[PDB]
Coordinates of C-alpha atoms and ligand atoms in Angstrom, one line a residue:
Chain A
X1 CA -2.6 -38.2 58.7
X2 CA -4.4 -37.0 55.5
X3 CA -1.8 -34.6 53.9
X4 CA -4.7 -31.7 53.7
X5 CA -4.8 -32.4 57.5
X6 CA -0.8 -32.4 58.3
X7 CA -1.5 -28.6 56.7
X8 CA -4.2 -28.0 59.1
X9 CA -2.4 -28.6 62.5
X10 CA 0.6 -26.1 60.8
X11 CA -1.8 -23.5 59.6
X12 CA -3.2 -23.9 63.1
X13 CA 0.0 -23.0 65.1
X14 CA 0.8 -20.8 62.5
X15 CA -2.5 -18.9 62.9
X16 CA -3.0 -19.2 66.9
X17 CA 0.8 -17.7 67.4
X18 CA 1.8 -21.0 68.9
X19 CA 5.2 -20.7 66.0
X20 CA 6.3 -18.0 68.1
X21 CA 5.7 -19.5 71.3
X22 CA 7.6 -22.6 70.7
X23 CA 10.6 -20.4 68.4
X24 CA 11.8 -18.7 71.8
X25 CA 11.7 -21.6 73.7
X26 CA 14.5 -23.5 71.5
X27 CA 18.1 -22.8 72.9
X28 CA 20.4 -21.2 70.5
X29 CA 23.4 -23.4 71.4
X30 CA 24.4 -26.3 73.5
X31 CA 23.7 -26.2 77.4
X32 CA 26.7 -28.2 78.2
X33 CA 29.4 -29.2 76.0
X34 CA 29.6 -26.4 74.1
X35 CA 33.2 -25.5 73.7
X36 CA 34.6 -24.2 70.5
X37 CA 38.3 -23.9 71.8
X38 CA 39.7 -25.0 68.7
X39 CA 38.1 -22.3 67.1
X40 CA 38.5 -20.0 69.4
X41 CA 42.3 -20.0 69.0
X42 CA 44.3 -17.1 68.0
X43 CA 45.6 -18.8 65.0
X44 CA 42.1 -19.8 63.9
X45 CA 40.3 -16.3 64.2
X46 CA 41.8 -15.2 60.7
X47 CA 39.6 -18.3 59.6
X48 CA 36.1 -16.9 61.1
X49 CA 34.0 -14.4 59.2
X50 CA 32.0 -13.8 62.7
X51 CA 33.9 -14.5 66.0
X52 CA 30.9 -15.6 67.5
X53 CA 29.3 -18.0 65.0
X54 CA 31.6 -20.9 65.6
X55 CA 31.5 -25.4 65.5
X56 CA 32.2 -27.5 68.7
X57 CA 35.3 -29.2 68.7
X58 CA 33.5 -32.3 68.7
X59 CA 31.5 -32.3 65.4
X60 CA 34.1 -29.6 63.5
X61 CA 35.1 -30.5 60.0
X62 CA 38.4 -31.9 60.6
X63 CA 40.9 -30.9 57.7
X64 CA 44.0 -33.3 57.6
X65 CA 46.8 -31.0 59.0
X66 CA 49.4 -28.8 57.2
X67 CA 51.7 -26.8 58.2
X68 CA 50.0 -23.6 57.4
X69 CA 47.0 -24.5 59.2
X70 CA 48.5 -26.6 61.9
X71 CA 45.3 -27.5 63.5
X72 CA 43.3 -28.2 60.1
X73 CA 40.6 -25.8 61.1
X74 CA 37.7 -25.2 59.2
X75 CA 34.6 -22.9 59.9
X76 CA 32.4 -26.1 59.2
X77 CA 30.1 -28.2 61.3
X78 CA 29.0 -32.2 60.8
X79 CA 25.4 -32.3 60.7
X80 CA 24.3 -36.3 61.2
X81 CA 20.7 -36.5 62.7
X82 CA 18.3 -39.3 62.7
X83 CA 14.3 -39.2 63.3
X84 CA 12.7 -43.0 63.2
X85 CA 16.0 -44.4 61.6
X86 CA 16.2 -42.1 58.5
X87 CA 19.3 -40.7 58.9
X88 CA 21.0 -37.2 57.2
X89 CA 24.3 -36.1 56.4
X90 CA 25.0 -32.5 56.3
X91 CA 28.3 -29.9 56.4
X92 CA 27.2 -27.0 57.2
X93 CA 30.0 -24.2 56.8
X94 CA 30.5 -20.2 56.5
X95 CA 30.9 -19.1 53.4
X96 CA 34.4 -19.2 52.6
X97 CA 37.0 -16.0 53.0
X98 CA 39.9 -15.3 50.6
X99 CA 42.4 -17.0 52.7
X100 CA 40.1 -19.7 53.3
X101 CA 39.0 -21.1 49.9
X102 CA 41.9 -23.0 50.1
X103 CA 40.6 -25.0 53.2
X104 CA 37.3 -24.7 51.5
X105 CA 38.1 -27.3 48.8
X106 CA 40.4 -29.0 51.1
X107 CA 37.1 -29.7 52.9
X108 CA 35.2 -30.4 49.6
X109 CA 37.6 -33.0 48.6
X110 CA 38.5 -34.5 51.7
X111 CA 34.8 -35.2 52.8
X112 CA 34.2 -36.3 49.1
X113 CA 31.5 -33.8 48.5
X114 CA 29.4 -33.8 45.0
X115 CA 26.9 -30.9 45.9
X116 CA 27.4 -27.4 47.4
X117 CA 24.0 -26.1 48.3
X118 CA 24.8 -22.0 48.2
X119 CA 21.8 -20.2 49.8
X120 CA 23.1 -16.6 49.5
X121 CA 24.4 -13.9 46.8
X122 CA 27.7 -13.5 46.7
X123 CA 27.2 -9.7 47.9
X124 CA 24.0 -8.5 49.7
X125 CA 23.9 -4.9 50.7
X126 CA 27.4 -4.1 50.2
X127 CA 28.2 -7.0 52.6
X128 CA 29.9 -10.3 51.7
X129 CA 28.4 -13.2 52.4
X130 CA 31.1 -15.4 50.1
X131 CA 34.0 -15.2 48.6
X132 CA 34.4 -16.3 44.7
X133 CA 35.7 -19.5 45.4
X134 CA 34.7 -21.0 41.3
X135 CA 35.9 -19.2 38.5
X136 CA 33.5 -16.9 36.4
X137 CA 32.2 -18.3 33.1
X138 CA 32.6 -15.7 30.3
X139 CA 35.7 -14.3 31.2
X140 CA 39.1 -15.8 30.5
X141 CA 39.6 -16.7 34.3
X142 CA 37.7 -20.1 33.6
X143 CA 40.0 -22.1 35.7
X144 CA 41.2 -21.0 39.8
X145 CA 43.8 -23.1 41.9
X146 CA 43.6 -23.3 45.5
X147 CA 46.5 -25.2 47.2
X148 CA 46.4 -28.5 45.1
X149 CA 43.0 -28.1 43.7
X150 CA 42.3 -26.8 40.0
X151 CA 38.5 -25.9 39.9
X152 CA 37.2 -25.5 36.0
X153 CA 33.8 -23.7 35.6
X154 CA 32.6 -25.5 32.9
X155 CA 28.4 -24.9 32.4
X156 CA 25.9 -23.0 34.2
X157 CA 22.0 -23.2 33.6
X158 CA 19.6 -20.8 35.3
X159 CA 16.3 -20.6 36.3
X160 CA 14.2 -17.6 38.2
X161 CA 15.1 -18.3 41.7
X162 CA 18.2 -20.7 41.5
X163 CA 21.3 -21.6 39.6
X164 CA 22.7 -24.6 38.5
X165 CA 26.9 -24.7 38.0
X166 CA 28.6 -27.6 37.1
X167 CA 32.3 -27.6 38.2
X168 CA 35.4 -29.8 37.5
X169 CA 37.9 -30.5 40.2
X170 CA 41.6 -31.5 39.9
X171 CA 44.1 -32.7 41.9
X172 CA 47.0 -31.8 40.6
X173 CA 49.2 -34.3 42.9
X174 CA 47.2 -37.3 41.8
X175 CA 45.3 -36.2 38.3
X176 CA 42.2 -36.9 40.0
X177 CA 39.3 -35.4 38.7
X178 CA 35.3 -34.9 40.2
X179 CA 32.6 -33.2 38.8
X180 CA 31.1 -31.1 41.4
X181 CA 27.4 -29.6 41.3
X182 CA 27.2 -25.9 43.0
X183 CA 23.5 -25.3 43.3
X184 CA 22.9 -21.1 44.2
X185 CA 19.9 -19.9 45.2
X186 CA 19.7 -16.2 44.1
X187 CA 15.7 -15.4 45.1
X188 CA 16.3 -14.8 48.7
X189 CA 15.7 -10.9 49.5
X190 CA 19.0 -8.8 51.2
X191 CA 16.1 -7.7 54.4
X192 CA 13.9 -10.8 55.1
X193 CA 12.6 -14.0 53.7
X194 CA 11.5 -15.0 50.2
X195 CA 8.5 -14.4 49.4
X196 CA 8.1 -16.9 46.3
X197 CA 7.6 -19.9 48.6
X198 CA 7.1 -22.3 45.4
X199 CA 10.5 -21.5 43.9
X200 CA 12.5 -22.0 47.5
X201 CA 10.5 -25.6 47.6
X202 CA 11.8 -25.7 43.6
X203 CA 15.2 -25.1 44.8
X204 CA 14.8 -27.9 47.4
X205 CA 13.9 -30.2 44.6
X206 CA 16.5 -29.2 42.6
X207 CA 18.8 -30.4 45.4
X208 CA 17.3 -34.0 45.4
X209 CA 17.2 -34.8 41.5
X210 CA 21.1 -33.7 41.9
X211 CA 21.2 -36.0 45.0
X212 CA 19.5 -38.7 42.8
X213 CA 21.6 -38.2 39.6
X214 CA 25.3 -38.3 41.8
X215 CA 24.2 -41.6 44.1
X216 CA 23.0 -43.4 41.1
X217 CA 26.9 -44.1 40.2
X218 CA 28.6 -44.7 43.5
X219 CA 27.8 -48.1 44.1
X220 CA 29.6 -48.5 47.8
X221 CA 28.4 -44.0 52.2
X222 CA 26.9 -41.3 49.8
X223 CA 28.5 -38.1 50.5
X224 CA 27.0 -35.4 52.6
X225 CA 25.7 -32.0 51.2
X226 CA 27.4 -29.0 51.7
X227 CA 25.2 -26.0 52.9
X228 CA 26.5 -22.6 53.4
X229 CA 25.5 -19.1 53.7
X230 CA 26.8 -15.8 55.2
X231 CA 27.5 -17.6 58.7
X232 CA 26.3 -21.2 57.3
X233 CA 24.0 -21.1 60.6
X234 CA 20.7 -19.0 59.8
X235 CA 19.7 -19.8 55.9
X236 CA 21.5 -22.9 56.1
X237 CA 19.5 -24.2 59.2
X238 CA 16.7 -22.9 57.0
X239 CA 17.5 -25.2 54.1
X240 CA 18.5 -28.3 56.6
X241 CA 15.5 -28.0 58.8
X242 CA 13.2 -27.7 55.7
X243 CA 14.7 -30.6 53.9
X244 CA 14.1 -33.1 57.1
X245 CA 10.6 -31.9 57.7
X246 CA 10.0 -32.3 54.2
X247 CA 10.7 -35.8 53.8
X248 CA 8.6 -37.0 57.5
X249 CA 5.8 -35.4 55.6
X250 CA 6.8 -38.0 52.4
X251 CA 7.6 -40.8 54.4
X252 CA 4.4 -40.2 56.9
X253 CA 5.8 -39.8 60.2
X254 CA 5.1 -37.4 63.1
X255 CA 6.3 -33.9 62.8
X256 CA 7.7 -32.1 65.9
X257 CA 9.4 -29.2 64.3
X258 CA 11.1 -27.6 67.3
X259 CA 12.2 -31.4 68.6
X260 CA 14.4 -31.6 65.2
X261 CA 15.4 -28.0 64.9
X262 CA 16.8 -28.1 68.8
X263 CA 18.6 -31.6 67.6
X264 CA 20.1 -29.3 64.7
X265 CA 21.4 -26.7 67.2
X266 CA 23.6 -29.5 69.1
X267 CA 25.8 -29.8 66.6
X268 CA 26.0 -26.3 65.1
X269 CA 24.8 -23.4 67.3
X270 CA 22.3 -20.8 65.9
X271 CA 20.8 -22.9 63.4
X272 CA 17.8 -21.1 62.0
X273 CA 18.8 -17.6 63.7
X274 CA 15.7 -15.3 63.4
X275 CA 11.9 -16.0 64.0
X276 CA 11.1 -14.7 60.1
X277 CA 13.5 -17.9 59.3
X278 CA 11.6 -19.8 61.5
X279 CA 8.1 -19.0 60.6
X280 CA 9.4 -19.2 56.2
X281 CA 9.9 -23.3 57.6
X282 CA 6.5 -23.8 58.9
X283 CA 4.9 -21.5 55.6
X284 CA 7.1 -23.2 53.2
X285 CA 6.0 -27.0 54.8
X286 CA 2.4 -25.8 54.3
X287 CA 3.1 -24.2 50.8
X288 CA 4.4 -27.4 49.6
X289 CA 1.6 -29.7 51.6
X290 CA -1.0 -27.8 48.8
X291 CA 0.9 -29.8 45.8
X292 CA -2.3 -30.5 44.5
Chain B
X1 CA 33.8 -15.2 22.9
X2 CA 34.9 -17.3 25.7
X3 CA 31.5 -18.8 26.8
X4 CA 28.6 -20.0 24.3
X5 CA 25.4 -19.4 25.2
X6 CA 23.2 -22.8 23.8
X7 CA 19.5 -23.6 24.0
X8 CA 18.9 -27.2 24.1
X9 CA 15.7 -28.0 23.4
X10 CA 14.4 -31.5 25.2
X11 CA 12.1 -33.6 23.4
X12 CA 9.1 -32.3 25.2
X13 CA 9.9 -28.9 23.2
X14 CA 11.1 -27.3 26.4
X15 CA 14.3 -25.3 26.3
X16 CA 17.0 -25.1 28.3
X17 CA 19.7 -22.1 28.2
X18 CA 23.4 -23.5 28.9
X19 CA 26.2 -21.2 29.0
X20 CA 29.2 -23.4 28.2
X21 CA 33.0 -23.2 28.7
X22 CA 34.9 -23.7 25.6
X23 CA 36.4 -26.9 27.3
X24 CA 32.9 -28.4 27.8
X25 CA 32.5 -31.5 25.6
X26 CA 29.0 -32.5 24.2
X27 CA 28.9 -35.5 27.0
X28 CA 29.0 -33.0 29.6
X29 CA 25.7 -31.2 28.0
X30 CA 24.1 -34.7 27.8
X31 CA 25.0 -35.5 31.1
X32 CA 23.5 -31.9 32.2
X33 CA 20.6 -32.8 30.5
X34 CA 20.1 -36.4 32.0
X35 CA 20.0 -34.7 35.6
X36 CA 17.4 -32.4 34.8
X37 CA 15.2 -35.3 33.3
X38 CA 16.4 -37.7 35.8
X39 CA 17.3 -39.7 32.8
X40 CA 19.6 -42.5 34.3
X41 CA 20.2 -44.6 30.9
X42 CA 21.7 -42.0 28.9
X43 CA 23.4 -44.3 26.5
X44 CA 20.8 -44.8 24.3
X45 CA 21.1 -40.6 23.4
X46 CA 23.1 -37.7 22.1
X47 CA 22.2 -34.4 21.0
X48 CA 22.1 -33.0 17.3
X49 CA 21.8 -29.9 15.6
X50 CA 21.3 -28.3 12.4
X51 CA 24.4 -27.4 10.3
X52 CA 25.7 -25.0 7.5
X53 CA 23.5 -27.4 5.2
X54 CA 20.3 -28.3 7.8
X55 CA 21.5 -31.7 7.9
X56 CA 21.3 -33.2 11.5
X57 CA 24.4 -34.4 12.3
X58 CA 24.8 -35.3 15.5
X59 CA 27.4 -33.5 18.2
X60 CA 30.9 -35.4 18.7
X61 CA 30.2 -35.9 22.4
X62 CA 33.8 -36.8 23.1
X63 CA 34.8 -33.2 21.4
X64 CA 34.3 -29.8 23.0
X65 CA 30.5 -28.3 21.8
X66 CA 31.3 -24.8 22.1
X67 CA 33.5 -24.7 18.8
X68 CA 31.3 -27.0 17.1
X69 CA 28.2 -24.8 16.7
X70 CA 30.5 -21.8 16.2
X71 CA 32.1 -23.6 13.2
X72 CA 29.3 -26.2 11.7
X73 CA 25.9 -24.7 12.9
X74 CA 23.4 -22.0 11.9
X75 CA 22.4 -21.2 15.6
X76 CA 23.7 -22.7 18.9
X77 CA 20.7 -24.5 19.7
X78 CA 21.3 -28.3 19.4
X79 CA 18.2 -30.7 19.9
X80 CA 18.0 -33.9 22.5
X81 CA 17.0 -37.1 20.4
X82 CA 17.8 -41.0 20.3
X83 CA 20.8 -41.7 18.4
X84 CA 21.0 -45.1 19.1
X85 CA 17.6 -47.0 18.4
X86 CA 16.9 -50.1 20.0
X87 CA 15.5 -53.3 18.1
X88 CA 13.6 -54.4 21.1
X89 CA 11.7 -51.7 23.3
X90 CA 11.2 -54.1 25.7
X91 CA 15.0 -54.1 26.6
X92 CA 14.3 -50.5 28.2
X93 CA 14.1 -51.2 31.6
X94 CA 14.0 -47.8 33.7
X95 CA 10.7 -45.8 33.5
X96 CA 12.4 -42.5 32.8
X97 CA 14.1 -43.7 30.0
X98 CA 10.9 -45.0 28.5
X99 CA 9.0 -41.9 28.4
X100 CA 11.9 -40.1 26.6
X101 CA 12.0 -43.0 23.7
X102 CA 8.5 -42.5 23.8
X103 CA 8.4 -38.9 23.2
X104 CA 11.3 -39.5 20.2
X105 CA 9.2 -42.2 18.8
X106 CA 6.2 -40.2 18.8
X107 CA 7.8 -37.4 17.6
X108 CA 9.0 -39.3 14.7
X109 CA 5.6 -40.3 13.7
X110 CA 4.2 -36.5 13.8
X111 CA 6.7 -34.8 12.2
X112 CA 6.7 -38.2 9.5
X113 CA 10.3 -39.5 9.7
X114 CA 8.3 -43.0 9.9
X115 CA 5.8 -43.0 7.3
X116 CA 2.4 -44.5 8.2
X117 CA -0.7 -44.8 6.6
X118 CA -3.9 -42.9 7.1
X119 CA -5.3 -45.9 9.6
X120 CA -1.9 -46.4 11.1
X121 CA -1.8 -43.2 12.2
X122 CA -5.6 -43.2 13.6
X123 CA -5.0 -46.1 15.9
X124 CA -1.7 -44.2 16.7
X125 CA -3.0 -41.1 18.0
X126 CA -5.5 -43.3 20.4
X127 CA -2.8 -44.6 22.7
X128 CA -1.3 -41.3 22.2
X129 CA -4.4 -39.7 24.1
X130 CA -4.7 -42.0 26.6
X131 CA -1.2 -41.6 27.5
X132 CA -0.9 -37.5 27.1
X133 CA -4.2 -36.4 28.1
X134 CA -5.1 -39.7 30.3
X135 CA -8.4 -41.3 31.2
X136 CA -10.7 -38.6 30.7
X137 CA -12.8 -36.6 33.3
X138 CA -15.5 -35.9 31.1
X139 CA -9.9 -31.8 24.6
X140 CA -8.4 -33.3 21.3
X141 CA -8.6 -30.1 18.8
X142 CA -6.2 -28.8 21.4
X143 CA -2.5 -30.2 20.5
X144 CA -1.4 -32.1 17.6
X145 CA -2.4 -35.7 17.0
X146 CA -1.8 -36.7 13.3
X147 CA 1.1 -36.7 10.9
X148 CA 1.5 -33.7 8.3
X149 CA -0.1 -35.7 5.0
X150 CA -4.9 -31.6 5.2
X151 CA -8.9 -31.6 4.2
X152 CA -11.4 -30.1 6.9
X153 CA -13.7 -33.0 6.9
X154 CA -11.3 -35.7 6.9
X155 CA -9.9 -34.0 10.1
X156 CA -13.5 -34.4 11.8
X157 CA -13.6 -37.9 10.8
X158 CA -10.8 -39.1 11.3
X159 CA -10.6 -37.3 15.3
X160 CA -14.0 -38.9 16.1
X161 CA -12.7 -42.5 15.1
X162 CA -9.8 -41.4 17.4
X163 CA -12.3 -40.3 20.3
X164 CA -14.1 -43.3 19.9
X165 CA -10.9 -46.0 20.4
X166 CA -10.3 -43.5 23.3
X167 CA -13.2 -45.2 25.5
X168 CA -12.0 -48.9 24.3
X169 CA -8.4 -47.8 26.2
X170 CA -9.4 -46.6 29.3
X171 CA -8.3 -48.1 33.1
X172 CA -5.0 -48.5 31.7
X173 CA -2.1 -47.0 32.6
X174 CA -0.3 -43.8 30.6
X175 CA 3.0 -46.1 31.5
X176 CA 1.3 -49.0 29.4
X177 CA -0.4 -46.7 26.8
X178 CA 3.5 -45.8 25.9
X179 CA 4.9 -48.8 25.9
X180 CA 1.9 -50.6 23.5
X181 CA 2.5 -47.2 21.6
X182 CA 6.0 -47.7 21.3
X183 CA 6.0 -51.6 20.4
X184 CA 3.7 -50.7 17.2
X185 CA 6.2 -48.4 16.2
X186 CA 9.0 -50.4 16.9
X187 CA 7.7 -52.8 14.5
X188 CA 7.3 -50.1 11.2
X189 CA 9.7 -49.7 8.0
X190 CA 12.0 -47.1 8.1
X191 CA 12.0 -47.0 11.8
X192 CA 15.1 -46.0 13.6
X193 CA 16.7 -45.7 9.8
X194 CA 18.3 -42.1 9.2
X195 CA 19.0 -41.6 5.5
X196 CA 22.1 -39.2 4.1
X197 CA 22.4 -38.1 0.5
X198 CA 25.0 -39.6 -1.9
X199 CA 25.7 -40.7 -5.2
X200 CA 25.8 -43.9 -6.0
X201 CA 29.0 -45.5 -8.5
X202 CA 27.1 -44.5 -11.5
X203 CA 26.5 -41.0 -10.1
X204 CA 22.7 -41.6 -9.3
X205 CA 21.9 -40.0 -6.3
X206 CA 20.8 -41.6 -3.6
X207 CA 20.3 -42.6 0.4
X208 CA 22.5 -44.1 2.6
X209 CA 22.6 -45.1 6.4
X210 CA 23.0 -47.6 9.2
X211 CA 20.4 -49.9 9.8
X212 CA 20.0 -52.8 12.6
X213 CA 21.0 -55.2 10.2
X214 CA 23.8 -53.4 8.7
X215 CA 24.3 -50.6 5.7
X216 CA 21.2 -49.8 3.9
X217 CA 21.4 -48.4 0.3
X218 CA 18.1 -47.0 -0.5
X219 CA 17.5 -45.7 -4.2
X220 CA 15.8 -42.2 -4.7
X221 CA 15.3 -43.7 -8.5
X222 CA 13.0 -46.6 -7.1
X223 CA 15.9 -49.4 -7.7
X224 CA 15.2 -51.9 -4.7
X225 CA 17.2 -51.0 -1.5
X226 CA 20.5 -53.1 -0.9
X227 CA 21.0 -53.8 2.6
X228 CA 24.8 -55.4 3.3
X229 CA 29.5 -60.0 5.8
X230 CA 31.0 -56.6 5.9
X231 CA 34.5 -57.1 6.5
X232 CA 34.7 -53.1 8.1
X233 CA 33.8 -49.6 7.4
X234 CA 36.9 -46.9 6.3
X235 CA 36.6 -43.2 4.5
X236 CA 38.6 -42.0 1.9
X237 CA 38.5 -38.1 0.3
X238 CA 34.7 -37.3 -0.4
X239 CA 34.0 -41.0 -0.6
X240 CA 32.8 -43.4 2.4
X241 CA 33.6 -47.6 1.4
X242 CA 32.8 -51.0 2.9
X243 CA 34.2 -53.8 2.7
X244 CA 33.4 -57.7 2.1
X245 CA 34.2 -53.9 -1.8
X246 CA 32.0 -50.9 -2.2
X247 CA 32.5 -47.5 -2.0
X248 CA 29.9 -44.4 -2.3
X249 CA 30.7 -40.6 -3.1
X250 CA 29.3 -37.3 -1.0
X251 CA 29.3 -33.9 -0.6
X252 CA 32.4 -33.1 1.0
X253 CA 35.1 -34.9 3.2
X254 CA 33.3 -33.5 6.3
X255 CA 30.4 -35.4 5.5
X256 CA 32.2 -38.3 4.9
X257 CA 34.2 -38.7 7.9
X258 CA 31.0 -38.0 10.2
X259 CA 29.4 -40.9 8.5
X260 CA 32.0 -43.3 9.0
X261 CA 32.1 -42.6 13.3
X262 CA 28.3 -43.3 13.3
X263 CA 28.0 -46.3 11.2
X264 CA 31.0 -47.8 13.4
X265 CA 29.0 -46.4 16.3
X266 CA 26.0 -48.1 15.7
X267 CA 28.0 -50.9 14.6
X268 CA 29.5 -51.1 17.7
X269 CA 25.9 -50.6 19.7
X270 CA 24.5 -53.2 17.9
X271 CA 27.2 -55.9 18.5
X272 CA 27.1 -54.8 22.1
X273 CA 23.1 -55.9 22.5
Ligands
CL1 CL1 23.8 -17.5 57.8

């Protein structure tokens, strides 16, 4: 019940080594109904970073089909989750490729997305984690056009562990505009997990602060938040799982971390990909509880 | 060249460094600042900078901010502040909108925009401590609690006067100490009044601005301040004129056209309130 006593149970599970045992018994993907036939199509192979990290057909984000993309396919999963009535709306996707930047902005528009959570640098260790899908400030190319959408980079403020970028997205056919807040975590190392737990907590707080800012203006549902990493599974799952459990701590509620993660993996395979990533969630929850 | 690295000083003196696009308007920065401040009622506020004459010119929220600081400012640093002072601070409903108002009203007292006597400056600092510091665990020499003015032994006398009215205000919430602090500054003279240098129809220098009642003209030579009934407001050349028909003159045509905007702005803000 106590915040300091909820912390001890988490610390005890970490100290006694239970988090390593309970992580290994969680299944990586769906036991049944795990078909990803739409993603496994030859025409869609060009649209996947990794051919082994795919969305399920019944939860994939489903673009309005066109003639270039006959299946309206994008490597993105819908993540809707509920605990004791508290509902959660996420969209998890891989880092956009060059040929899927149009598909990415098609999804951001069609799903009414207003906040993007990028948990990775564009490149890490010389490997591409996400293509540069929003224009760069400082250059003369401060505007890009993907399909029917013309994105402009409008400001950028840099905190030590994260960077907030404000984007304006214009539908050239209709003329409609939409402010899109781009939150990028920049403190995750190339190998391993972040050491600055308090800094990663601030990145999750900025997400909520932007979530509260955008929802005050929308009187009529609230759009899902787009988390993306290299494959949209491991660091993506860390953000989603952390933010879910922190709410269970906030609104006093029994914490069953493997039960939530097992539910998350029923909607996107391999959410929280490594043991390090899982113990990181335990350490982040502990550090949050030691707020005072 | 293609972007401006600007620094926005919040009312609590913190800094936020914004890399700004050339197209970005001042409204977009103010909305970005409101996000970080958790502020919801963004209508009462705006941003301002020191111009070439070190005069507080509020930014044009509808025009791009990058061009304004390049063309008309010393350094690329704007300041967060209240452009629309409300008559009733009871009108402010949201909690965080009140705290930022509290910071602006406190800064108006500590820096001397609103002149207060010795005793008023004493009673003000008492409610400030109960909200700035809180109900003491036991501390006042730390930060500034008084306006400009000082003699070392008058500082010791007043600080203990604040340190005794500190205990009388005990057990009350800091949000309520902020309210009672505002609703006293709320009722002072010069509260929410901004003066701009100008010359009169006789060439005598003066100070002109827009108060809640209407356009106030105070005179440097001590002449009784007139408070204008106004059919409309207009601006011509280096002059600025009201109609009933009176006209004042300013430094240059930039300065006068600037004042016409704020007057009609404050006139629009007050007629809605
Ligand atoms: Cl990943």
